[PDB]
Amino acid sequence: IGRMEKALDEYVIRGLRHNICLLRDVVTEPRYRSGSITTNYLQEQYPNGFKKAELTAEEMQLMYEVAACVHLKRERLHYTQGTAPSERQLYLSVGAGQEGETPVYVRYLDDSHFEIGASKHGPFRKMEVVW
């Protein structure tokens, strides 16, 4: 299953819609991983239309961190020669109303390594992003 989970996310499809979200949500459901299912499983678990499951706090935090890293990496490309920055303090907030402003730092110690933290003078984790 884990393999499928991972393999679903690496399938790049552009130009038309698909049902990969439904497959992902069905596989990730703890009912499906319980061990047994039924033939009325789908409509039993999807009474009104279809609604994809949401994200937990840590997943949304990780998405924020990766977004900040990507922003910094693409920003450094446009600068000329060595006149480029290496650290910022960003304020990420999804939604049109800035729901949950989360301050973020970034350091870009190498080509594919950062020092993400809460802000300046905050403990750093040194994750990795390759894009």
Binding site: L77, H78, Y79, T80, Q81, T83, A84
Partner: protein, 489 residues
């Protein structure tokens, strides 16, 4: 400390200094002049002097490259110009003329300052002359953040590109009060000169943005494309994308039926680098696309027809749009890449009553006068004078290519069959139109004459374009000596 700007933000609007701070780098703005007064002494203006005098001019720095800018201030006197406001702008433009640096201005003026008399006209004239002289020397970009009325509208017009903000901006020559006075019609300011009107109807505005923040964010991206001056070379940026990336999806873009339509962006996007298109005038004359893009890390100019809208037929507005884009691109040594799909010109009385002859000649003049490297690709068809206009090989074109299902003919098969057989026996349609289209509506004849270099598979377009654009990097061509041309206005 957030003093004196609470009144501004309460109206859901930003300040000039905040806009300047958002545009440039975090700490690289050096305000030039800050303690200047109007010295008017008329109509009870001897009092209420202001330190900044309603203008903010500085130098700044974007992406490590220098810039010059100025911003109007709406709080102070409504942003009106004077004998003294225009002096700062003139000094900035003169300095940016000595050094090869561009100029960007954020217009917010409410009109002229009446209390100065004709001195406002003097300042306007000086700014107009500087814009006229320095156009083609340094790129000029203008953004309109608020009201812009009176005769001040003309200086943004001479500038290369004008952008507009959606909710709280407008521009026109004469106010609606005079329109009501003379004609008797009641029209609001937005109905007269709103951003939508200039985006779709008049064709003056080159774009529209939803917010000031987005305006700055994308203005930086636009600035990343431009060359610094007239004599400086085209910028080249590092990029991980490579010319060996596979593009085989182009083999299927063109439908096998001649009456079905397709989107030209499906051809434009694969050739250029990923996520590197900046469309210019997206909502005006949609049958033609113009903008900037990068090919192997160097900025180029894109001009292509679109059979999605009106069968990709040339027109007045499309001609003006393409002509302006080509002229600007050539003025600053930027390569041009074109994609051709045209059945001809739009037929109609309104067209001749509006002067198609003048307007359609502008694109041809711009294409013929240009001396930058050109690359042309004929995908499906090219008929009549439209084939000549859209950068044909005879107009000193560098390299021309065609796709295996193209067609290059004098006109459609029906008209040729009609003219070639006056009173030939009836039913001549079936056994003559098919034969003529088979024999002469194909790139074989044009290739025999030598009008296309080679017939290529659609999968090799990126390879060919990168090769040619790399080889043509150092072409030196010059026109005969002239004081200047005489373009059909």
């Amino acid at each position: 400390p957030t003093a004196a700007e609470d009144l501004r933000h309460k109206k859901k609007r930003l300040t000039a200094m905040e806009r300047v701070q958002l545009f440039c780098d975090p700490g690289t703005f050096r305000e030039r002049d800050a303690l200047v007064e109007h010295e008017c002494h008329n109509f009870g203006m001897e009092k209420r002097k202001v330190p900044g005098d309603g203008f903010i001019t500085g130098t700044g720095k974007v992406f490590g490259r220098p810039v010059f800018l100025f911003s109007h201030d709406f709080t102070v006197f409504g942003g009106s110009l004077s004998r003294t406001n225009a002096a700062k702008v003139v000094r900035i433009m003169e300095e940016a003329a000595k050094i090869g640096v561009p100029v960007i201005g954020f217009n917010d003026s409410g009109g002229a300052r009446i209390h100065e008399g004709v001195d406002s006209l003097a300042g306007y004239a000086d700014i107009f002359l500087r814009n006229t002289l320095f156009s083609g020397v340094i790129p000029q970009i203008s953004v309109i953040m608020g009201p812009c009325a009176g005769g001040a509208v003309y200086s943004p017009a001479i500038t290369d590109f004008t952008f507009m903000v959606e909710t709280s901006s407008y521009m026109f020559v004469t106010g609606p009060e005079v329109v009501s006075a003379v004609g008797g019609k009641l029209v609001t300011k937005d109905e007269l000169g709103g951003p939508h009107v200039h985006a779709t109807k008049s064709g003056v505005s080159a774009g529209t943005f939803p917010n000031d923040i987005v305006a700055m964010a994308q203005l930086r991206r636009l600035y990343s494309y431009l060359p610094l001056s007239n004599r400086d070379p085209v910028p080249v940026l590092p990029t991980a994308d490579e010319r060996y990336r596979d593009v085989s999806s182009l083999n299927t873009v063109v439908p096998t039926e001649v009456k079905e339509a397709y989107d030209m962006r499906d051809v434009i996007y694969p050739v250029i680098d990923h996520d590197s298109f900046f469309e210019i005038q997206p909502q005006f004359a949609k049958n033609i696309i113009c903008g900037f893009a990068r090919v192997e890390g160097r900025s180029v100019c894109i001009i292509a027809n679109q059979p999605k809208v009106q069968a990709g037929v040339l027109d007045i507005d499309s001609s003006v749009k393409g002509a302006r884009m080509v002229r600007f691109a050539d003025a600053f040594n930027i390569p041009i890449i074109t994609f051709v799909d045209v059945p001809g010109f739009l037929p109609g009385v309104q067209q001749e009553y509006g002067g198609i002859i003048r307007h359609g000649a502008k694109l041809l003049y711009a294409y013929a006068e240009a001396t930058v490297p050109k690359v042309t690709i004929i995908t499906r068809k090219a008929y009549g004078g439209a084939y000549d206009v859209m950068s044909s090989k005879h107009l000193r074109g560098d390299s021309n290519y065609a796709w295996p299902h193209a067609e290059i003919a004098v006109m459609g098969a029906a008209g040729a069959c009609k003219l070639l057989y006056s009173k030939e026996t009836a039913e001549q349609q079936a056994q003559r139109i098919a034969d003529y289209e088979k024999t002469f509506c194909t790139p074989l004849s044009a290739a025999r004459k030598g009008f296309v270099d080679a017939v290529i598979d659609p999968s090799e377009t990126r390879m060919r374009v990168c090769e040619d654009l790399e080889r043509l990097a150092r072409k030196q061509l010059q026109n005969p000596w002239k004081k200047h041309g005489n373009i059909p206005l």
